[PDB]
Amino acid sequence: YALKQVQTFGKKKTAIAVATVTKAAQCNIKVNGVPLQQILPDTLRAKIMEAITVVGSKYYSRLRIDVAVHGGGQVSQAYAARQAIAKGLIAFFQKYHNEVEKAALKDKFLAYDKFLLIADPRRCEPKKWGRHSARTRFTKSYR
Amino acid sequence: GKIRTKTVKRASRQVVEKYYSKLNFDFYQNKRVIMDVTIAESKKLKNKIAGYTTHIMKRLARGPVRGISLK
Amino acid sequence: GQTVRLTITSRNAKAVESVTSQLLTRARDEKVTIHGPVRLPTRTLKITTRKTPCGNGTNTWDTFELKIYKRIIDLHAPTEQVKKITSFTMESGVDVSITILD
Amino acid sequence: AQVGLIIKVLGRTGSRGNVTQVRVRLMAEAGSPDYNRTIVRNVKGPCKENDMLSLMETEREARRL
Amino acid sequence: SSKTPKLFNKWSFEGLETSELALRDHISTTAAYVPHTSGRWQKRRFYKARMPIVERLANGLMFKGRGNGRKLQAARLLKHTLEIIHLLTDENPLQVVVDAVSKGAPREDSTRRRQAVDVSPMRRVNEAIYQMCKGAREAAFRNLKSMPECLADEIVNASKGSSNSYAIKKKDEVERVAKANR
Amino acid sequence: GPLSKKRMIIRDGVFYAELFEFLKRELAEEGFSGVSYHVTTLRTEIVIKATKTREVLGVNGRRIRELTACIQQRFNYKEGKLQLYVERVEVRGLSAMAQVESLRFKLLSNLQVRRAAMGIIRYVMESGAKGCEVTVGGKIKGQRAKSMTFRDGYMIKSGTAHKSFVDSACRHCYMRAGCIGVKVKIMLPGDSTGRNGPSEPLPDVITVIEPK
Amino acid sequence: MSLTLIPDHFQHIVRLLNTNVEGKRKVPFALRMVKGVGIRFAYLVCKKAGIDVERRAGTLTAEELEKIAEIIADPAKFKIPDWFLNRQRDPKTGKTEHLSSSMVDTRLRDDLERLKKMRAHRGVRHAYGLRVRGQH
Amino acid sequence: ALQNAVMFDKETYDKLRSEVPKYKLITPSIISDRLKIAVSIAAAGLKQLCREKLIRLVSCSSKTRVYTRIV
Amino acid sequence: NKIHRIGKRKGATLKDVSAWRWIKTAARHFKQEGKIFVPNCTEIMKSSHGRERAPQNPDWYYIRCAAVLRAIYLRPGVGYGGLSKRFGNKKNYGSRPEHTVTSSTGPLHWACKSLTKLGLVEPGAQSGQRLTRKGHKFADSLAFQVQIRKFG
RNA sequence: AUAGGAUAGCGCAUUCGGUCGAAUUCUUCUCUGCGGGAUUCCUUUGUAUUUGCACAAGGUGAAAUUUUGGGCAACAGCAGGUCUGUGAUGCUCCUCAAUGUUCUGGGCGACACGCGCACUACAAUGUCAGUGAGAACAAGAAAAACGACUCGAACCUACUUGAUCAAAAGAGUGGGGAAACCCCGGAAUCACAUAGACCCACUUGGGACCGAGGAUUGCAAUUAUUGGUCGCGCAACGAGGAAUGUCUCGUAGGCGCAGCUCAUCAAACUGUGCCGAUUACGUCCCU
Ligand SMILES: [K+]
Ligand SMILES: [K+]
Ligand SMILES: [Mg+2]
Ligand SMILES: [Mg+2]
Ligand SMILES: [Mg+2]
Ligand SMILES: [Mg+2]
Ligand SMILES: [Mg+2]
Ligand SMILES: [Mg+2]
Ligand SMILES: [Mg+2]
Ligand SMILES: [Mg+2]
Ligand SMILES: [Mg+2]
Ligand code: NA
Ligand code: NA
Structure with a gap:
């Protein structure tokens, strides 16, 4: 019938995760083509699972979500992926549901963790000359 | 610290004197008004002037202000 | 159908934008099909060197940067028409290259 | 281990400023001899108003300096 | 369908309260699934007191050069430690950890001669985590016991007030010295 | 290849x-x-x-x-x-390169440093520049070398805007005693035409337009 | 980790190629205690002798020790390639061989004496107790 | 200092079969320090007991194994 | 149950199961069938010169063949150099700092040749290696068997 | 499952960047020239308050105080450094067996030792062996010369062979002037319920020293140029006295990668991204 598709994104450091949310026959969420229960380590699996458990799986009833994450490392990608999933649910309800249930979902997401919907603005601080890093100066000797 | 420099304060006083009728207590409308009656290569200064201009407007409602004539 | 690509390259941002806008306006005057202009990624040539001529003092460095701005405009027009569009005075430091896409 | 509530922070005493001086209201039961008794104490570590302390000895009072 | 988070999907945060009245506002019992949160907890002065207590334990497990920045590793060590704590005590590991934190730091300290001062609740939580992690790290250095075993034994002994705990032994010595500096 | x-x-x-x-x-x-x-x-x-x-x-x-x-x-x-x-x-007086060459020529003609430097400043300020700052250094009087600067009007030193409003040039003068350095800086008057002046208002100058 | 009861013939030290080999270790890491045999060579020796590397030394019988010594003495006989041996082309004899036990020390002393007799630079550096590679 | 055997004998293996069960907490390090055996042959054997379901596996990992007695 | 299909899901494909579990099941299948060609050099060579010791697993070549088979499934058109970046490690240089070194392309060349002999992979048109139709069927069928917990 | 836990799904089931398919539709992600956006803006039964200038918490918000990090940075100076950057330069020295210039060979690297910086470690929050998932800054080839007749080759890299048997090599076939090839840039810190080996020992820690083989760069490798292989490991080192360096958030620390020097060679520097804390958010005790 109608497609009923929504595309969102989430960011964490240099990682960019793009989630495509589609009405389908059954719920099916994959990150880079990998099912949720096949994501390792279990610590990062639980972090991505937070986008579903804090609102309940009832709102992901018939949603097929495909998340493509590029850039960053394993932890940064996991945070970008969970944010993309959470924003994908909110944008789907924004487009195909009324405001009361969308606001309820958004309030629950923000109550649990701010960065489920709002990207973390932190980035690597540039290195400066005369320093080994952003702030670590060269060792000074006197005698 | 957020001390307004004399350049910001002087421009704010000039704006208030010349365009008192066009200003109110809202920063955003005052910022829009100032961007039309001011030439300045810095948007940071114009934002600061708008902030101090609406501050002077609040003070003027609460009695007189030194440095403002409104003759 | 012949597709011709115009590549505008310079290290001055204002000059490359002025040339691109002039080419775009002239191309629309001859009502030819336009694809773009595409703002390709700008490359920064970076050279970092010591400030002192000798080796004395705190090891301070100068980071010199050169930015290159490139634009591509694809035209569906004959070579005679694309020559007419190109036929105008460009700013100094702007390189415009004409190539026929395969 | 009497529990006391910090009602105000007087200032950062000491040469290095690590120790801070606060006014502590004892959190005693109603009708207790220590009910609403306030003393001045020196506190190590980050402390804020409305924090709670575990006083080992309530007789000692910190110098006002 | 949303349910309360359980740490590693096994341990419940329901009814998790510290016995100490002074430390009630500085030990966080907020429910979480794993001790991993990319939060900016050091932005404000007392913001880290709202960080979940288990995550603060994990942050204390990545200390030396070989340990710095290994937070998934610390989470794995905590996952094993909580299982060992549960077996040792037949109790909720979260409650045992909270009890250990509530007793791992001295209530009174001596500072610069030296004179006795009281310790703020924030420092008490900070020192208890720091001392327990330090004691476990030194106990497991050149020992057959694994790190989860040493950390579990430290936390169990601290939760009971036992003198076998490194943190309690440090606490008793500091409070004794502070008493003599009154 | 190309x-x-x-x-x-x-x-x-x-x-x-x-x-x-x-x-x-x-x-x-x-x-x-x-x-x-x-x-x-x-x-x-x-x-x-x-x-x-x-x-x-x-x-x-x-x-x-x-x-x-x-x-x-x-x-x-x-x-x-x-x-x-x-x-x-x-306008020659608004060109630092032209003025620094003029100063070097005048110094090579055994003219006193004070006379030549002030002559440049008077000519530059007459040309409409907001400010001029010339400096001469090295073996001016005797064996010991000293640096002396002559300035008039406005001059901005910091920021990146002085790269546009300030015209600079430095030359070497070869005298019998040795080498003399001459540096000339001209504060270009902001003129709406881009030939002589950046045409932009000064970075820290704020102007309020008079009402009708 | 074998879950095997300790044999009645278990030896805490096994003598192999005039070397006291610790029988507490796994076979490949007990063979590396023989001079001339490393971790890589010992794994090859155990492979050619049919002994799995999960056994503990000291459980090796006399027959297994003899087979190990035969392989170490003449690795090329047991199809170990030449590129895997110590002396691929002896500078005096010209034959590819593998040195083990006291032969490593003896051949090293002969190499130093040979370089010293020529009065070559590397030999003279050895004579003065100095680093012979680049170093400083 | 410590002398941990790298192979079981009759006595240690029998103690492994009988007394290592009905332990509230079971770990190869704990068994190694009680039976005076190497941790490698303690981690093995504990696996054998778990295979025969004389003990239960509580927390499993690539490096860390935690067991407990069967109720 | 543990192996019951989740609602409307039926069958299985690669990337739907544990990568290691699929690789070990494929390696067991390769060893059990016995038709795969194993070079004699695998008994003495190391996987890469960046490694310090021998691969320490008697069936390491079968595991490597399964791993490269899965890698070719994931990225069609890969070559020996592309596979070398996958199986590289960090080399210990002693007192010098460590650096990343790609794996030796010898074993990767052997592994692809063994798979080509089995008919699972073929030289992709315009460079690289690719999975045959038989190879794609083999990977998916084994993925389903892993999900059913059949193994070998 | 060899013993197999926990972890979402319960009108249309998923997957295939070689399926080296074909067409419509688009900009969510990417690229970017000019814009917008944040300023003490709003609030306070706060502080301080004649006022004013302001401050502190909390809102709003991507961002809440010089947003964050840099660049620039006055006037006076220093007998600071550079005459080893220049066809910058005064005076002076040498100037035809030359202190000019070139060529050959040595040296700048020498080692009882002292000192500053860095790298690697002392191990089980580990070492090996395997497998998984996975970045960002960046670099890449030549002439008024050589061959053909404007083009080719130099530089980088992919694929394949070498390969019916080690690495490192060696060879072809393409591609790339660099958002086009490399490249879907498979970095390793990391992860693994891998049912893997080791088990607290100078030990499978450490990898310094040294021996033989072979390859490569170069006109030339001896004073090992640099990789690769097998040996040596029995060389100390089991956490380091007095003293002392740097650092407040994507920071310290840890981890690599690129550029740069470069025919060959990074423990250096200049950048880049990845994993990511403890503590304080105070004072004038020391400097
Ligand atoms: K001064
Ligand atoms: K070696
Ligand atoms: Mg200024
Ligand atoms: Mg400034
Ligand atoms: Mg790998
Ligand atoms: Mg190491
Ligand atoms: Mg090393
Ligand atoms: Mg390192
Ligand atoms: Mg030198
Ligand atoms: Mg080693
Ligand atoms: Mg250097
Ligand atoms: Na340990
Ligand atoms: Na001179």
């Missing part, structure tokens, strides 16, 4: 830097004030800015054709592929 764009830009910059150095040394006594080149398919057109355009050209353009021969032979330009033009600077 060199990459990075290599082409580097090559064009190196060509300009060498061209500027050659003309700076060749036209030192003609008030050389700058050079710009425009490249087409037909030819490369180079425009030289100088104060004394008559001496840059010569009789029937003998000097300008000699300079063309120099550039053509060094850079292997073909016949008819290179052209030189000479244009005068509208």
Whole structure:
């Protein structure tokens, strides 16, 4: 019938995760083509699972979500992926549901963790000359 | 610290004197008004002037202000 | 159908934008099909060197940067028409290259 | 281990400023001899108003300096 | 369908309260699934007191050069430690950890001669985590016991007030010295 | 192949830097004030800015054709592929390169440093500059070297805006005792025309438009 | 980790190629205690002898020790390639061989004496107790 | 210092079969320090007991194994 | 149950199961069938010169063949150099700092040749290696068997 | 499952960047020239308050105080450094068996030792062996010369062979002037319920020293140029006295990668991204 598709994104450091949310026959969420229960380590699996458990799986009833994450490392990608999933649910309800249930979902997401919907603005601080890093100066000797 | 420099304060006083009728207590409308009656290569200064201009407007409602004539 | 690509390259941002806008306006005057202009990624040539001529003092460095701005405009027009569009005075430091896409 | 509530922070005493001086209201039961008794104490570590302390000895009072 | 988070999907945060009245506002019992949160907890002065207590334990497990920045590793060590704590005590590991934190730091300290001062609740939580992690790290250095075993034994002994705990032994010595500096 | 764009830009910059150095040394006594080149398919057109355009050209353009021969032979330009033009600077007193050459010429003629430096400042400030700052250093009086600066009007030193509003140039003077350095800075008057002045308002100047 | 009861013939030290080999270790890491045999060579020796590397030394019988010594003495006989041996081309004899036990020390002393007799630079550096590679 | 055997004998293996069960907490390090055996042959054997379901596996990992007695 | 299909899901494909579990099941299948060609050099060579010791697993070549088979499934057109970046490690240089070194392309060349002999992979048109139709069927069928917990 | 836990799904089931398919539709992600956006803006039964200038918490918000990090940075100076950057330069020295210039060979690297910086470690928050998932800054080839007749080759890299048997190699076939090839840039810190080996020992820690083989760069490798292989490991080192360096958030620390020097060679520097804390958010005790 109608497609009923929504595309969102989430960011964490240099990682960019793009989630495509589609009405389908059954719920099916994959990150880079990998099912949720096949994501390792279990610590990062639980972090991505937070986008579903804090609102309940009832709102992901018939949603097929495909998340493509590029850039960053394993932890940064996991945070970008969970944010993309959470924003994908909110944008789907924004487009195909009324405001009361969308606001309820958004309030629950923000109550649990701010960065489920709002990207973390932190980035690597540039290195400066005369320093080994952003702030670590060269060792000074006197005698 | 957020001390307004004399350049910001002087421009704010000039704006208030010349365009008192066009200003109110809202920063955003005052910022829009100032961007039309001011030439300045810095948007940071114009934002600061708008902030101090609406501050002077609040003070003027609460009695007189030194440095403002409104003759 | 012949597709011709115009590549505008310079290290001055204002000059490359002025040339691109002039080419775009002239191309629309001859009502030819336009694809773009595409703002390709700008490359920064970076050279970092010591400030002192000798080796004395705190090891301070100068980071010199050169930015290159490139634009591509694809035209569906004959070579005679694309020559007419190109036929105008460009700013100094702007390189415009004409190539026929395969 | 009497529990006391910090009602105000007087200032950062000491040469290095690590120790801070606060006014502590004892959190005693109603009708207790220590009910609403306030003393001045020196506190190590980050402390804020409305924090709670575990006083080992309530007789000692910190110098006002 | 949303349910309360359980740490590693096994341990419940329901009814998790510290016995100490002074430390009630500085030990966080907020429910979480794993001790991993990319939060900016050091932005404000007392913001880290709202960080979940288990995550603060994990942050204390990545200390030396070989340990710095290994937070998934610390989470794995905590996952094993909580299982060992549960077996040792037949109790909720979260409650045992909270009890250990509530007793791992001295209530009174001596500072610069030296004179006795009281310790703020924030420092008490900070020192208890720091001392327990330090004691476990030194106990497991050149020992057959694994790190989860040493950390579990430290936390169990601290939760009971036992003198076998490194943190309690440090606490008793500091409070004794502070008493003599009154 | 065909060199990459990075290599082409580097090559064009190196060509300009060498061209500027050659003309700076060749036209030192003609008030050389700058050079710009425009490249087409037909030819490369180079425009030289100088104060004394008559001496840059010569009789029937003998000097300008000699300079063309120099550039053509060094850079292997073909016949008819290179052209030189000479244009005068509208205001000489607003050009730091022209004034620093004038100061060097006056110093080489045994003129006192105070006299020559103040003469430059008076000429520059008469030209409409917001400010002028010339400095002369090295063996001015005797064996010991000292630096003396002469300034008038406005001058901005910090930020990045002084790269646009301030025109600078430094030359070496070869005297009997040794080497003397002369540096001239001119605070260009912000003029709505871009020839002499950045045409932008000063970065920290705020103007309130008078109501109708 | 074998879950095997300790044999009645278990030896805490096994003598192999005039070397006291610790029987507490796994076979490949007990063979590396023989001079001339490393971790890589010992794994090859155990492979050619049919002994799995999960056994503990000291459980090796006399027959297994003899087979190990035969392989170490003449690795090329048991199809170990030449590129895997110590002396691929002896500078005096010209034959590819593998040195083990006291032969490593003896051949090293002969190499130093040979370089010293020529008065070559590397030999003279050895004579003065100095680093012979680049170093400083 | 410590002398941990790298192979079981009759006595240690029998103690492994009988007394290592009915331990509230079971770990190869704990068994190694009680039976005076190497941790490698303690981690093995504990696996054998778990295979025969004389003990239960509580927390499993690539490096860390935690067991407990069967109720 | 543990192996019951989740609602409307039926069958299985690669990337739907544990990568290691699929690789070990494929390696067991390769060893059990016995038709795969194993070079004699695998008994003495190391996987890469960046490694310090021998691969320490008697069936390491079968595991490597399964791993490269899965890698070719994921990225069609890969070559020996592309596979070398996958199986590289960090080399210990002693007192010098460590650096990343790609794996030796010898074993990767052997592994692809063994798979080509089995008919699972073929030289992709315009460079690289690719999975045959038989190879794709083999990977998916084994993925389903892993999900059913059949193994070998 | 060899013993197999926990972890979402319960009108249309998923997958295939070689399926080296074909067409419509688009900009969510990417690229970017000019803009917008944040300023003490709003609030306070706060502080301080004649006022004013302001401050502190909390809102709003991507961002809440010089947003964050840099660049620039006055006037006076220093007998600071550079005559080893220049066809910058005064005086002076040498100037035809030369202090000019070139060529050959040595040296700048020498080692009882002292000192500053860095790298690697002392191990089980580990070492090996395997497998998984996975970045960002960046670099890449040549002439008024050589061959053909404007083009080719130099530089980088992919694929394949070498390969019916080690690495490192060696060879072909393409591609790339660099958002086009490399490249879907498979970095390793990391992860693994891998049912893997080791088990507290100078030990499978450490990898310094040294021996033989072979390859490569170069006109030339001896004083090992640099990789690769097998040996040596029995060389100390089991956490380091007095003293002392740097650092407040994507920071310290840890981890690599690129550029740069470069025919060959990084424990250096200049950048880049990845994993990511403890503590304080105070004072004038020391400097
Ligand atoms: K001064
Ligand atoms: K070696
Ligand atoms: Mg200024
Ligand atoms: Mg400034
Ligand atoms: Mg790998
Ligand atoms: Mg190491
Ligand atoms: Mg090393
Ligand atoms: Mg390192
Ligand atoms: Mg030297
Ligand atoms: Mg080692
Ligand atoms: Mg250097
Ligand atoms: Na340990
Ligand atoms: Na001189």
